[PDB]
Every structure is written in structure tokens, then in C-alpha cells.
Amino acid sequence: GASKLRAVLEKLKLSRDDISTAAGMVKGVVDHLLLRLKCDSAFRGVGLLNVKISAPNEFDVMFKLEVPRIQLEEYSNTRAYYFVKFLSQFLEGEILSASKMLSKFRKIIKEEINDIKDTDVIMKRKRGGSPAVTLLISEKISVDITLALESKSSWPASTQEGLRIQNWLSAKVRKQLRLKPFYLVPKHAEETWRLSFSHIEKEILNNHGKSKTCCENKEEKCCRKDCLKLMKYLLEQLKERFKDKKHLDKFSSYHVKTAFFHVCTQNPQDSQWDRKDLGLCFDNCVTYFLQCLRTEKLENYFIPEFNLFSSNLIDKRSKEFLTKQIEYERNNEFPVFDE
């Protein structure tokens, strides 16, 4: 039961030196990119947001951009995607073009990756939709660099009922977090940006307990992070197996992370994450995730009425597929976690 799950966690640790040198190799490139971008007029004020690492060999950095005051107009009744208006060059009328601002980004990075031949890097474009300009360092370490407009404005109205952390983290912490900037990434679904809160996701994962002193001492070790690790790992391991038909590629660790936050709201006390109960805690996350699949419904933690599992994004076939795989997995004490 747990023993099997502790074994997986111990295994996972064995590659703790592998990801640290691979990410140090990401760092050197990102530092290099920040310099060359602060030499351009458009991007002069860029910085790094802080918040990295998704799957093994897959990294994510965010390049924040301080911008004057933003006014948003919600695109359609899609609660996450917006237009932007008061960098002049990128105007299409009064609207700041995501597509245009994402092209001058991708441009600068392509030119300035050929030189510094020191490291062997290739610029890539991965997928449509995506706001990430995706590099591949020495054909093994791929990094997602995502540009991010910063708005020190009050969050948009579609986030009014999101971040329901009051019963787990304090109502006062939700106020602290919603006084913080939010971010727009040029993901279009069109010249449209969509909301991001990856910096808030980093804080509620690292400052995750009802007790302010969760995980700071031997009396208060919860298994929240471990559970999210096992969930992330369950998805990767399954995405490997069923790559004989590449039928699970729409699912990602964000889904696992999103669903885990939802479980943390349902189970707000550290006592529900006692590390002795790792097995039952892990069950909790897997049963909720299933429910999300089978009900075709998984709310963005910050944008409730944005359904990461609607038909728009993932079709019914792929979700029924993963429901069957995860259901079999749970019913049999997870043979994917064997040997």
C-alpha cells in the first residue's frame, strides 16, 4: 500500500541530481536571454517571474514584463481570455496584439540562440495555441519560455469566486494573494491574451498548510507535496504505456496540479494530510481526479467557469479512455508502480 508508494517516492529521488544539472543548464540560457532582451526597447523591463519544471526533461520559465495600466475586455463568455489596452509598435488600433508581441519575442530569441555556440541549443516551435517559445538544449533538456505581461490591477471579475482557499488557508491569505499582480500570457484560443497565476500556484504549494508551521518540524509532516508528486507521476507513467496510440497527449501535469488544489480545499486540515495516511491521502486525489474525468469537468482553480475538461479542449473519447485506465489502476493497488 503506502510501502509501494514510499518506494515510488524513493525511486523518484534517485534522479534529484539529474534534474538539478539539467536545470542549471536551463538557467545559464535564461540568464543569457534576460540580458539580451533588456537591450531592446519593447522588452527593456523584462525580468524572471520569481516557478519552473513540469515533467522530466521539460522545463518552464516565465519572462514577466512590467507594463503601464491595463484595461481588459473579456473575449466572448470565455472567462480566461481577454483583450488588452492602455509597446506602441504592437497596437492594432487601441488593442495590444498578443500575436504581434509574441512574434517579436520569438524573433529575438531565435537570432540570439545561434551565437554563444558554447552550448548546443536549437529553437523550436512545439504546438498551436501555446504562448511558450520552446527551446531544446543539447537535444534532451527542453525549456518553455513564456512571456508574461504584469498587471498590478485588481484581478478580473471571473476570478471573484476562484481561489477558494478561505477554509484551508486563511480568508486573510486570500486577501494577501489577491493584492498581488496577475499575469497575461499570449495564448490566444486572434490577438488575445489569457490569465495566468503560476506565481500564486508556487506560493500555495510551498506555503500549503493550515498551520503556518506545516512541514517546518518533525511533529508536522504532511504528505501534500508527496501526493501531488505521485499524481504527476501516475500521469506520466500512463502517458508512456498508452503512447502505443498516443491517445493521452492532451492530459498534462496542470490538470493533476489543478485537481490537487481542489482536493486541498476539500481537505483543509493538516490532519487530513498526515503522512502516515499517505495511502488514503493518495486515494483522495485519485478519486477526485476520476470524478473530474467522468463528469467531464475540472474548474480552473482561479477561474471557476473555465472548464479545463470541456469538449472544446479534450474530446469525450480521450477522457473515457483515461477514466478506464485510472479506474483499473486504483482498483488494483496501481500495477504501474511495480518494480
Ligand X SMILES: Nc1nc(=O)c2ncn([C@@H]3O[C@@H]4COP(=O)(O)O[C@H]5[C@@H](O)[C@H](n6cnc7c(N)ncnc76)O[C@@H]5COP(=O)(O)O[C@@H]3[C@@H]4O)c2[nH]1
Annotated binding residues for Zn(2+), written as ranges, equal 208, 214-215, 222
Length of the chain: 339
Least distance from C-beta 128 to ligand X, angstroms? 7
User: Which residues are at the interface with ligand X (CB under 6 A)?
Assistant: 60, 127, 129-132, 144, 146, 185, 187, 196, 198, 252, 254, 308, 313
**Is the Cβ of residue 251 or residue 334 nearer to ligand X in the bound state?**
251
Using CB distances below 5 to 8 A depending on partner kind, what does residue 252 bind out of Zn ion, ligand X, none?
ligand X
**Is the Cβ of residue 109 or residue 185 nearer to ligand X in the bound state?**
185
Q: Do the Cβ atoms of 171 and 157 come closer than 8 Å? A: no
**Is the Cβ of residue 169 or residue 184 nearer to ligand X in the bound state?**
184
What are the binding residues for Mg(2+)? 58, 60, 144
- Residue 182, judged by CB atoms within 10 A of its CB (0-12, 13-18, 19+), counts as buried
Least distance from C-beta 144 to ligand X, angstroms? 3
Nearest residue to 256 via CA among 278, 282, 279: 282
Least distance from C-beta 273 to Zn ion, angstroms? 7
Using CB distances below 5 to 8 A depending on partner kind, what does residue 158 bind out of Zn ion, ligand X, none?
none
Q: Where are the beta strands (DSSP E) in the chain?
A: 46-48, 58-66, 71-74, 81-85, 91-92, 95-96, 121-124, 132-137, 141-151, 182-185, 193-196
Nearest residue to 53 via CA among 191, 231, 232, 220: 232
Q: Could you give the 3-state DSSP secondary structure of residue 54? A: coil
Using CB distances below 5 to 8 A depending on partner kind, what does residue 234 bind out of Zn ion, ligand X, none?
none
Using CB distances below 5 to 8 A depending on partner kind, what does residue 313 bind out of Zn ion, ligand X, none?
ligand X
**Is the Cβ of residue 67 or residue 214 nearer to Zn ion in the bound state?**
214
